[PDB]
Design an enzyme around this catalytic site. Structure first.
Site, PDB file in Angstrom:
ATOM      1  N   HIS A 186      87.501  44.295  12.026  1.00 40.13           N
ATOM      2  CA  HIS A 186      88.124  45.093  10.976  1.00 40.13           C
ATOM      3  C   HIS A 186      87.197  46.184  10.452  1.00 40.13           C
ATOM      4  O   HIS A 186      86.017  46.232  10.796  1.00 40.13           O
ATOM      5  CB  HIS A 186      88.559  44.193   9.817  1.00 40.13           C
ATOM      6  CG  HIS A 186      87.420  43.500   9.137  1.00 40.13           C
ATOM      7  ND1 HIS A 186      86.923  42.288   9.564  1.00 40.13           N
ATOM      8  CD2 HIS A 186      86.673  43.856   8.064  1.00 40.13           C
ATOM      9  CE1 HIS A 186      85.923  41.923   8.782  1.00 40.13           C
ATOM     10  NE2 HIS A 186      85.751  42.857   7.863  1.00 40.13           N
TER      11      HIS A 186
ATOM     12  N   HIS B 195      82.631  51.413   9.203  1.00 40.68           N
ATOM     13  CA  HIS B 195      82.234  50.858  10.486  1.00 40.68           C
ATOM     14  C   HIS B 195      83.016  49.597  10.829  1.00 40.68           C
ATOM     15  O   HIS B 195      83.622  48.969   9.962  1.00 40.68           O
ATOM     16  CB  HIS B 195      80.742  50.535  10.481  1.00 40.68           C
ATOM     17  CG  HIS B 195      80.381  49.396   9.580  1.00 40.68           C
ATOM     18  ND1 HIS B 195      80.357  49.511   8.207  1.00 40.68           N
ATOM     19  CD2 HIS B 195      80.052  48.113   9.857  1.00 40.68           C
ATOM     20  CE1 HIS B 195      80.016  48.350   7.676  1.00 40.68           C
ATOM     21  NE2 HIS B 195      79.826  47.484   8.655  1.00 40.68           N
TER      22      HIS B 195
END
Length: 167
Positions: A42, A116
């Site tokens: 995720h 990220h």
């Protein structure tokens, strides 16, 4: 009742998760670090830590007031943070919709935001970091409030609430 470990996140299409974990298993041995599960992949927009039921409820209202057009994520970048020992996947020039959505969630809840997707943890040794696969690009339609919990040393993310982005 009891507090939960909450965070907001952007998710990945199923086919791209599969594309990523294949790319990871090609350029990174088990010795490179600890692989993040496919279903656990995720992009965290805001980490909340332990949150009371009262605080969660207030956050879900503030999150529901957010009005933002959808946006596209193209994952053109991959790298390694040596101190935190992680190999991450990301974007060179993140879309304004991504920066704005994160900042609003960080603001309502309140290290700078560097979006990220963590691929490996405990990546203490330096390793050559290949570029991402081709055309890892998709449209973002919503963001989700998640609650983490650790059963047997394995991390499982449980979704609680989802908010669509205008489009």
């Amino acid at each position: 009742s009891e507090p939960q470990r909450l965070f907001f996140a952007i998710d990945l299409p199923a086919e791209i998760r599969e594309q990523i974990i294949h790319w990871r298993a090609k350029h990174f041995p088990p010795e490179a670090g600890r692989p993040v599960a496919a279903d656990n992949l995720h992009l965290t927009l805001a980490f909340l830590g332990e949150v009371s039921a009262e605080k969660e409820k207030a956050l879900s209202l503030l999150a529901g007031r957010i009005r933002q057009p959808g946006f596209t994520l193209t994952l053109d970048d991959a790298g390694q943070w040596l101190r935190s020992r992680v190999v991450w996947l990301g974007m060179r020039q993140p879309p304004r919709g991504l920066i704005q959505l994160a900042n609003m969630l960080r603001s309502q809840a309140a290290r700078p935001f560097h979006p990220h997707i963590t691929l490996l943890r405990d990546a203490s040794e330096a390793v050559t970091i290949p570029p991402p696969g081709f055309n890892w690009s998709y449209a973002v339609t919503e963001f989700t409030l998640y609650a983490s919990s650790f059963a047997r040393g394995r991390t499982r993310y449980t979704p609680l609430k989802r908010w669509a982005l205008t489009q």
